C-alpha cells in the first residue's frame, strides 16, 4: 500500500527517510520515523502516526523499510492537516475566544489534553505561536510560520 | 444595593452552565458559602472602603 503517494512526495519522503536510513537499503525504526514524518511538508498526529505503524508494521516490531515508508506516508496524505483548521482550533483553548490564548492556560491544556506536550515544549510553542509576547498566543502568525514548511 | 444586584447577576454567570454567557465551574455549596461570607462581611464594612477609596 505504498501507492497512495505521489512522486513529488516519494522523492523527499526518501530523502528525509534517508536521514536515518542505513546504507541505502531502506530501513529505519519508528521513533526516527516519527521524526521523519514531521519534516516531509506534513503534520502527522501521533495517533494517526501509530495507527499507521499498526497496519504497515504488521507485528509492530519497530523496524520499517522504504516501501513500508512509502506505505506509511500513503495514508498520511489522507489525514493531512490543513491551514485554516488549526487557526480555528487555537480558538478553543481560548475559553472566551478573545482572539488569543492566555499565558499558562496554553501550558495546562497542551500538557494534559490531546497529544500532550511538556512545559519546555510549551515554552517552545510560546516562542513559536505566542509571538505577541509571554502569554497572548497569536495563532494567525503561528499558522503563517508553520505553513511556510 | 446596586453593587449587590450587579454581583448577584455576575454570580449566575459562573454558577449555571449556559455558554458563552456562563460556565459550570463551581458547585452550589460553594456559591452559597461565598454569598454568605460576602453578605456577612463586606457590605457591613462598606462604609470603610467608602471613606477610603471615594472622593
Amino acid at each position: 500500500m505504498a501507492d497512495q503517494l505521489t512522486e513529488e512526495q516519494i522523492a523527499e519522503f526518501k530523502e528525509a527517510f534517508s536521514l536515518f536510513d542505513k546504507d541505502g537499503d531502506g530501513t529505519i525504526t519508528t521513533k526516527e520515523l516519527g521524526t521523519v514524518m514531521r519534516s516531509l511538508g506534513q503534520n502527522p498526529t501521533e495517533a494517526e502516526l501509530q495507527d499507521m505503524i499498526n497496519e504497515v508494521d504488521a507485528d509492530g516490531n519497530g523496524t520499517i523499510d522504504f516501501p513500508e515508508f512509502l506505505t506509511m506516508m500513503a495514508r498520511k496524505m489522507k489525514d493531512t492537516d490543513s491551514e485554516e483548521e488549526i487557526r480555528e482550533a487555537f480558538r478553543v483553548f481560548d475559553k472566551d475566544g478573545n482572539g488569543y490564548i492566555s499565558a499558562a492556560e496554553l501550558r495546562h491544556v497542551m500538557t494534559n489534553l490531546g497529544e500532550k506536550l511538556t512545559d519546555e515544549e510549551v515554552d517552545e510553542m510560546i516562542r513559536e505561536a505566542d509571538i505577541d509576547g509571554d502569554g497572548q498566543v497569536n495563532y494567525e502568525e503561528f499558522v503563517q510560520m508553520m505553513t511556510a514548511k | 444595593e446596586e453593587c449587590y444586584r450587579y454581583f448577584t447577576s455576575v454570580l449566575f454567570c459562573h454558577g449555571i452552565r449556559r455558554p458563552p454567557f456562563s460556565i459550570d465551574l463551581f458547585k452550589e455549596e460553594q456559591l452559597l458559602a461565598l454569598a454568605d461570607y460576602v453578605v456577612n462581611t463586606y457590605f457591613r464594612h462598606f462604609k470603610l472602603y467608602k471613606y477610603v477609596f471615594t472622593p
Binding site: 492537516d81 478553543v92 489534553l113 | 460556565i23
Partner: peptide
C-alpha cells in the same frame, strides 16, 4: 463544556 473541554482535546491532538 462540550466545546472547551473535549474539542480542546481534539484541537490539541491536531495543533
Amino acid at each position: 463544556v462540550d466545546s472547551f473541554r473535549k474539542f480542546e482535546n481534539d484541537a490539541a491532538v491536531m495543533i
